[PDB]
Design a protein around this ligand. Structure first.
Ligand SMILES: NC(=O)c1ccc[n+]([C@@H]2O[C@H](COP(=O)([O-])OP(=O)(O)OC[C@H]3O[C@@H](n4cnc5c(N)ncnc54)[C@H](O)[C@@H]3O)[C@@H](O)[C@H]2O)c1
Ligand SMILES: NC(=O)c1ccc[n+]([C@@H]2O[C@H](COP(=O)([O-])OP(=O)(O)OC[C@H]3O[C@@H](n4cnc5c(N)ncnc54)[C@H](O)[C@@H]3O)[C@@H](O)[C@H]2O)c1
Ligand SMILES: NC(=O)c1ccc[n+]([C@@H]2O[C@H](COP(=O)([O-])OP(=O)(O)OC[C@H]3O[C@@H](n4cnc5c(N)ncnc54)[C@H](O)[C@@H]3O)[C@@H](O)[C@H]2O)c1
Ligand SMILES: NC(=O)c1ccc[n+]([C@@H]2O[C@H](COP(=O)([O-])OP(=O)(O)OC[C@H]3O[C@@H](n4cnc5c(N)ncnc54)[C@H](O)[C@@H]3O)[C@@H](O)[C@H]2O)c1
Lengths: 22, 338, 338, 338, 338, 22, 23, 23
């Protein structure tokens, strides 16, 4: 959310913001 | 009949799905193209070869933009912004959303946009604007015209589902708790490197991993009567498939052990014949691979305390048992695709 | 001081109990004898290079009939029959029962009939007339006089008990049930192989193996107000070490997570000082190796249902975690010996 | 004709074989009794449940003291001692030695002492007086009037040998080595436990544990022309199956990479068809599950180094496969009987 | 003089660097800021709790703009592109390039044109114009005014080198190859998913992936004379850490193992005193964790063939035995700056 | 227990008789 | 073989797809 | 050096403290 919130909003399939409701 | 289908997300619910469809002796949809961050060669290989579901037995081949199985050559793609996916141009009535990214309502639509007609969410659906349907539980009320943006919820939510139901029917549920042990899924890291959910960052393979779930508050969607009554969690252990669910439910209509399992065998055949497999045998993981049912009660484990506090364990093949609850929901379409 | 102790079975825990003692400040126990289904090299070069503990920073020698950690020598005995074990002859107050086998009350007595003057078992104690005791539970309800045979319960329970305790001397547990998603042990075959339990038969570093457990029901046998209020289940999974419990419980006074959490907080700080750890972080299992607690709350994952129905989760080093708990039981019997 | 067989060692490999037979088109055999260290609920099971392989296609039944299998039903007897075995009294002709313990003729007599009239070991010969075959090397110097004490030696060597074949042929091995990378085997231990080989004593899932092997020079016994000319070693790894031989060997009629990797194109489909395969593909251990060939060559890897240095890699499924090198053999005796 | 250091990509290679250097008695550098794709919230973490390196014992805390490690503070940034990087404006003498992409001879100089005096690399140096150095090999040939773009090199080449070097001088290599069973790195998917090496696409936890390398031609360098003499490859496997290398080298000078290992035990008090180690013991991967060494040998396993064939084996912590040659090399530069 | 009650009896430290109540 | 893994691996090589460690 | 495993491996040659499969 500091970093991830956005990067993840921009490269959202990137190896690091990948959440599968398990 | 023959409605046109394609896949953004030929990865895991991808292949499973398809290997699963080409594996129906009578099927409603014609999957025509697949868009995948791989090339053709590749998407070719992986459909074919599997470390979990071994190999595929089918005549396979490809060129520089298509992949051929038994006959059906399908089209391999390479684009990221789904808008830039040639939907319109190929009368793609139906879109498969197995990238694990476009699970936004908003992320769903960019298929309609580019030019598609209906898109399916192989996972829980985010925010307002999506029909969330669990096969054999509320599929009762699928109507094409309802929502064009639909979800099949989670591997796990599926398990929780039929059982939740039959629980509601025969003894009905006050409130409970949920605890899935789950097998690692590619959103984790092999070994430690960055990740926004800091458990998900930890080496999947060597490490019990605990993560959020709402895949249990993923109930109400399918059960009106169960609004935030049973919150769960999950833990991500070292095996690459096949997972089991741990329910725990203070029921109101007082009850005993084997009378519960009674019902599971009643339902096991009654309503759910093909939804829940019913299992007294003494089994572990590698015994539910290749498995079609969804919820799969380990009976010889159920454990009613003080008549009220039921506890029931439940299996499932997370990859596969789902890649059928899709190809079932997926079929459901072509039969009201009005 | 010096009461004199011998370790039956140099087993995992049994070496783990050693590394645990040694590295302690002080003691009234003197690890003086140690008998295995092995020879002294084999048992020597195992106290050192250990899979999950890492190599012992230590000065370890060995002769053909005993070893020496830090020039302090204890014994090597090659013989299985506990009777045919020189206990009066070697002048032995106490015996660590870590064979994983002699865990009854009768068979068990076999160190007593050997000449050892008291029996301490690294396992739930099966049969009549035994004073299983749980540090920071009834740790204080122990009189040297009572039983000749005491056990320090099981991996799980020593983690499960110093928890339920709190929950009850607080909120009041009505009912319950449990499951420990647990690291795999040696009562499992590396491959599907012949076994009493068709699950333990089944290959371990690949599977998810429900095994019935009593680590639950047996919490009656230390917190009396509990008799048969708890019954758990045990999923077993390819981590070699560590585990955590899915404890759920009804109550008759209502509340919510914060209270719950904070009540442990205190406990991790006051009541259960040294017994319970507390965790407000996103951790994972191999983070909880080395842990000298028996119950690591992870409030993170704590939940609460309809105010009255609860569910907690604690990690516990199945291995080193426990083995401590014993130096905590052995010690007692030393500082009250007669 | 069509003779009678026994299975002595109904463990991992034991069953493999069994299924190996029950698959086949044609049979010169009929099994009817396995000696195991288990019970028959048990025998049935691991036959029909299997991490590696997977449940058996069949109606499968057991009773107190035997099982039936799609008709063809086999008798179940529990004897650690081979000499108290009912062979003469059941006229068992051939026994499969798959407890994996009576390697030496010594233990191979005690069944013939027991009235059966010949015996095949699923493991190396030990001491002298024991026969040795591998299809392809010398499937041919077969003569019934030689020994009733025979083995395929070992898994490993099924790979080494068929391969080693052509290699002396079309190039004339002077000398080499080889490292056999290799998933684990029921001889290790899940967790650190005692054992004679200290390597084989430590948790087999979480370490590359090295072990010492005869599959080496002991391949000069189907082509003595490699009389202590190979050798090499064994490296075990965390798979529960499939494995591969890292061979290297000098030459005096030299080569390029595609030279031999072309040689192995020939033998594949000819001299060695059914005893070797030929994947050039991008593959891993899991794909080779269930592969009947004794050796499988991943082309990609085959290499040179100034013509003479040669290196090749051979996947064997040491479990399943090794059996079809056996099942086969069982049917070289049954066929050539007197 | 302190040369002031920045770290690009806080990877495995990049977090271990930090722990090792941050450990030693007397250090010549000064770590100041690190460029991962990750807040400081997360980097604290993955440094604080390694899945493998176990708790890290130290005073670590984070703000929004740096991590603090026992007293000292370094700034953390999120920039993908090197050029945006405020290096000149941070008096950054040396950066570490270990995101493993700017492993180019070129691109990695984007670092410089972003301020930095010299830039280090942690993989091979592909493309022309780049320094590679095997600490304690050619390390003797170090020239500040030679390259600005160095390289420690593959986790396997640093294991390799301090081996072949040694043999090439004692006996002398004609030619060889190698292979290494390998810890499973971060570049091959946790499961079967898209990728550019069809094998890596495959789930390293559940398989045996062999892959190409230039870790050998790589030796054909810092050892000039081994020019296009040794090649081969390696297989990766479900052990998250420490790999191990089987070397197969001809020679021009015949020997016997018992001496082969003696010369080696030699370079384990001399020329490589702290480069190579030594087990007369019988160990297994997990035994070589935290091991500050480039090449571990098992004397025993070692084996001669005719005199002119040498099988040689070397362990190694791929993650750490390397993050101490980097550290080493780093501090090297730092001492011969200008 | 038509084979186990004893085998485990007479050989309790048997790989196949061992029972760890975790 | 660069219809993909290259025109895409030129651009985002941090990716789940393009990471080569010359190990 | 087998000061325990001759005797034991002579009564139980299949107790896991003893096995050897010669792959
Ligand atoms: N056990 C299970 O696998 C399970 C259970 C429930 C749900 N799911 C669902 O699986 C879905 C996908 O994850 P997965 O299981 O398929 O693992 P996966 O990695 O195999 O699926 C991801 C695939 O999609 C490809 N991809 C991602 N984004 C793309 C894009 N924008 N364009 C083209 N291709 C793209 C990836 O390269 C990969 O091939 C998740 O959304 C999750 O909800 C899985
Ligand atoms: N991680 C754990 O092991 C763990 C955790 C909690 C509780 N426990 C308790 O640990 C006990 C053993 O666990 P473990 O890890 O030590 O397994 P283990 O195999 O390492 O302990 C078995 C040891 O006991 C020895 N042994 C068995 N019978 C013997 C006899 N008659 N004479 C001499 N030696 C004999 C064997 O040689 C073996 O080395 C179990 O009963 C369980 O209740 C273990
Ligand atoms: N990697 C492989 O799977 C492989 C390949 C080739 C050869 N082998 C050889 O196979 C043999 C057995 O190995 P396995 O893989 O089948 O393991 P396994 O232990 O599963 O098979 C042995 C079975 O024999 C039974 N048994 C044990 N002791 C007995 C006795 N004294 N009398 C009667 N029955 C007894 C047990 O039920 C056990 O399950 C070994 O000699 C091994 O070297 C194994
Ligand atoms: N055993 C080994 O892992 C090993 C051995 C020898 C050499 N190497 C080399 O080490 C190098 C690093 O390997 P690693 O273990 O650190 O992989 P890693 O993923 O664990 O570390 C890489 C880190 O850099 C981050 N990163 C990615 N893209 C970035 C960018 N554009 N800007 C800034 N940061 C970015 C990643 O997210 C990750 O946290 C690799 O190139 C590898 O070939 C590794």
């Amino acid at each position: 959310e500091p970093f991830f919130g956005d990067y993840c909003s921009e490269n959202p399939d990137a190896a690091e913001c990948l959440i599968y409701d398990d | 009949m023959t409605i046109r289908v394609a896949i953004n997300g030929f990865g895991r619910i991808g292949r499973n799905f398809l290997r699963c469809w080409f594996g129906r002796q009578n099927t409603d949809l014609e999957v025509v193209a697949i868009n995948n961050t791989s090339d053709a060669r590749t998407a070719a290989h992986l459909l074919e070869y599997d470390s979990v579901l071994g190999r595929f037995n089918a005549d396979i081949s490809y060129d520089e933009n298509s992949i051929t199985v038994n006959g059906k050559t399908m089209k391999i793609v390479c684009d990221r912004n789904p808008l830039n996916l040639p939907w319109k141009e190929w009368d793609i009535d139906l879109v498969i959303e197995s990238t694990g990214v476009f699970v936004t309502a908003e992320g769903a639509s960019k298929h309609i946009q580019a030019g598609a007609k209906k898109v399916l969410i192989t996972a829980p659906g985010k925010g307002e604007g999506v029909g969330t349907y669990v096969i054999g539980v509320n599929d009762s009320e699928y109507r094409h015209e309802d929502f064009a943006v639909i979800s099949n919820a989670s591997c796990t939510t599926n398990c929780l589902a039929p059982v939740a139901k039959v629980l509601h029917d025969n003894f009905g549920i006050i409130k409970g708790t949920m605890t899935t042990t789950h097998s690692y899924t590619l959103d984790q890291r092999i070994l430690d490197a960055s990740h926004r959910d800091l458990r998900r960052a930890r080496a999947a393979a060597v490490n019990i991993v605990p993560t959020t779930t709402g895949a249990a508050k993923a109930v109400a969607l399918v059960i009106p009567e169960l609004k935030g009554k049973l919150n769960g969690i999950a833990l991500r252990v070292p095996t690459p498939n096949v997972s089991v669910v741990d329910l725990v439910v203070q029921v109101e209509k007082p009850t005993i052990t084997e009378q519960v399992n009674e019902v599971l065998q009643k339902a096991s055949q009654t309503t759910m014949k093909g939804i829940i497999k019913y299992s007294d045998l003494p089994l572990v993981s590698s015994d539910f691979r290749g498995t079609d049912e969804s919820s799969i009660v380990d009976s010889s484990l159920t454990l009613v305390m003080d008549g009220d506090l039921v506890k029931v364990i439940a299996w499932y093949d997370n990859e596969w048992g789902y890649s059928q609850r899709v190809v079932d929901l997926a079929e459901l379409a072509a039969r009201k695709w009005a």
